[PDB]
Amino acid sequence: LLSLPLVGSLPFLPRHGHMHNNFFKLQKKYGPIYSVRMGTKTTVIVGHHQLAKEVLIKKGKDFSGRPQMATLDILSNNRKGIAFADSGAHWQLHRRLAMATFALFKDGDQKLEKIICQEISTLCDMLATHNGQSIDISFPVFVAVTNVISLICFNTSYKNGDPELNVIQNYNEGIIDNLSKDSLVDLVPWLKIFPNKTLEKLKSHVKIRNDLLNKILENYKEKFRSDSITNMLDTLMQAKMNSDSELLSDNHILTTIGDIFGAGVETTTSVVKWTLAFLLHNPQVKKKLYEEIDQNVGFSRTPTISDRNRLLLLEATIREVLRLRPVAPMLIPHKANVDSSIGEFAVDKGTEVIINLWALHHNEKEWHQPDQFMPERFLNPAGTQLISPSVSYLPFGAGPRSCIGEILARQELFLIMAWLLQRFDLEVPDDGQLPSLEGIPKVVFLIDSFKVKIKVRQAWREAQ
């Protein structure tokens, strides 16, 4: 009477719970760092901030690779661009170019605060027409951030009603949906197991997206001139002519613009939706934010970047949203470029390594009541300045593969929330339904579409 032969073993049920939460629960049994193997591939899950900072910072270069995935190969055209590119010359080149591009908006007649505030005023006007109604603000916000990125990349933007915006929204939604079912970290490779159309569907969306990028590129090749470097595509093209020109082919440049448009639009739109959601569940915090803005900016002017020194609760709220609901609760998978180690455990070349950011932001030894939305935790006991209550906090990642849009992201988020609170009461709809805060884990941690009643504030109207 013997034990059964065991051909496979998994520690939890696939497709049951959010994987990032499942991995975190396993830490109780197994500690902050453990592995799983799928056939020949081995993946390592890291869940403590110290070990995470070893992988991301102290040994960044050792762990800066990206694993190959069938779906990411499609979206990135066989590993071009920045985000899904393996570490290497192509990756390093476009990455630095993209970062240098942000210097052309440091100030001057192309100031980032002004570009953003231009789109936000259009967004505000649009939303004012819905005065007294309940709406889903996904699309207006998406259009506003799409313009901002479009100005950074091409110095161009869309007029309201350009149906191209609906086209983009449509393939974005389709890409995000098919890129993964679960998180980007899929436990079992079901895609390569059962008959399915996922790759063909993803191809189809990626086709439409690429053909649109091709179109914009051929138009820009004729508008481009060496004496005017004002946007990202200039930088890529200026760099191509000075040139190792195999790293700056057409596909490379498109894939790069693709990632920039991708991350620029989807992440920022998502965090605004989450922020509005959390405020609808917390009228009291929302009350104090109105009081804060009314008493620090008033209705004599619009909010500006420099008001982030004054509106501290607004900055704390944004930080607390990125804690509870990180856009990428498992970053993007890393990969060991060389043989190495984490916490003095050996990690081989080619081993996939996921940072469970969700664990870092809910670690009970590092955060007081992690389950709770408490913007206060980012304010000194008085409320006079911001502080870092924990080092176990990495919403934008760190080291070599860290976010390159973080400042753009922080500022866009700050200004949208600041303007919106200045002009609008944002209440629960007359149906009384609150948004679900459970979320949907894709490559981005989406929130369910919900509605808000939007009303021009009486205090703003009086300002005439």
Ligand X SMILES: CC(=O)[C@H]1CC[C@H]2[C@@H]3CC=C4C[C@@H](O)CC[C@]4(C)[C@H]3CC[C@]12C
- Which segments are annotated as binding site? 172, 403
d(CA 94, CA 51): 29
Q: How far is the CB of 263 from ligand X (least distance, A)?
A: 4
Nearer to ligand HEM, 46 or 127 (CB): 46
Among the listed residues 370, 395, 439, 441, the single contact to ligand HEM using CB under 6 A: 395
Nearer to ligand HEM, 57 or 216 (CB): 57
* Binding map of ligand HEM across residues 254-273, x = CB under 6 A, - = no contact: -----xx--xx--xx--x--
Among the listed residues 140, 303, 397, 435, the single contact to ligand HEM using CB under 6 A: 397
110 binds, among ligand X, ligand HEM, none (CB under 5 to 8 A by kind): none
Nearer to ligand X, 144 or 175 (CB): 175
For residue 70, the SS3 value is helix
Interface positions with ligand X (CB under 6 A) = 75, 83, 172, 175-176, 179, 259, 262-263, 266-267, 327-328, 332, 443-444
The answer to whether 396 contacts ligand HEM (rule: CB under 6 A) is yes
The answer to whether 185 contacts ligand HEM (rule: CB under 6 A) is no
Among the listed residues 276, 409, 444, 447, the single contact to ligand HEM using CB under 6 A: 409
Nearer to ligand HEM, 33 or 453 (CB): 33
* Binding map of ligand HEM across residues 64-93, x = CB under 6 A, - = no contact: ------------------xx----------
Amino acid code (one letter) for 169: Q
Q: How far is the CB of 347 from ligand HEM (least distance, A)?
A: 16
Strand partners, 386: 379
Q: How far is the CB of 19 from ligand X (least distance, A)?
A: 16
Among the listed residues 48, 59, 90, 95, the single contact to ligand HEM using CB under 6 A: 95
Q: How far is the CB of 325 from ligand HEM (least distance, A)?
A: 10
Residue nearest to ligand HEM (CB): 405
The answer to whether 154 contacts ligand HEM (rule: CB under 6 A) is no
Of 221-229, 272-280, 290-298, 320-328, which segment contacts ligand HEM by CB under 6 A?
A: 320-328
d(CA 440, CA 320): 19
d(CA 67, CA 88): 13
Nearer to ligand HEM, 313 or 394 (CB): 394
- The beta-carbon contacts of 117-126 under 8 Å, at least 24 apart in sequence, are 117/302, 117/304, 117/415, 117/419, 119/144, 119/145, 119/147, 119/148, 119/157, 120/144, 120/415, 120/416, 120/419, 121/302, 121/419, 122/147, 122/160, 123/416, 123/419, 124/419, 124/420, 124/423, 124/424, 126/160
Query: What is the secondary structure of 290-320 as a DSSP string?
Result: HHHHHHHTTTSS---GGGGTT-HHHHHHHHH
d(CA 334, CA 332): 6
Backbone angles phi, psi at 352, to 5 degrees: -80, 140
Could you tell me the maximum CA-CA distance found in the chain, to the nearest angstrom?
88
Angle at 354 between CA 276 and CA 176, to 5 degrees: 50
Q: For residue 338, which of 323, 353, 316, 317 has the smallest C-alpha distance? A: 353
Q: Which residues are annotated as a binding site for heme?
A: 403
Nearer to ligand HEM, 101 or 363 (CB): 101
Residue nearest to ligand X (CB): 262
172 binds, among ligand X, ligand HEM, none (CB under 5 to 8 A by kind): ligand X
Residue 452 vs residues 138, 257, 397, 425, 432: alpha-carbon distances, Å: 11, 33, 31, 10, 10
Q: Which residues are annotated as a binding site for substrate?
A: 172
d(CA 353, CA 336): 7
Which residues bind to ligand HEM, rule: CB under 6 A? 82-83, 95, 259-260, 263-264, 267-268, 271, 322, 327-328, 331-332, 395-397, 401-405, 408-409
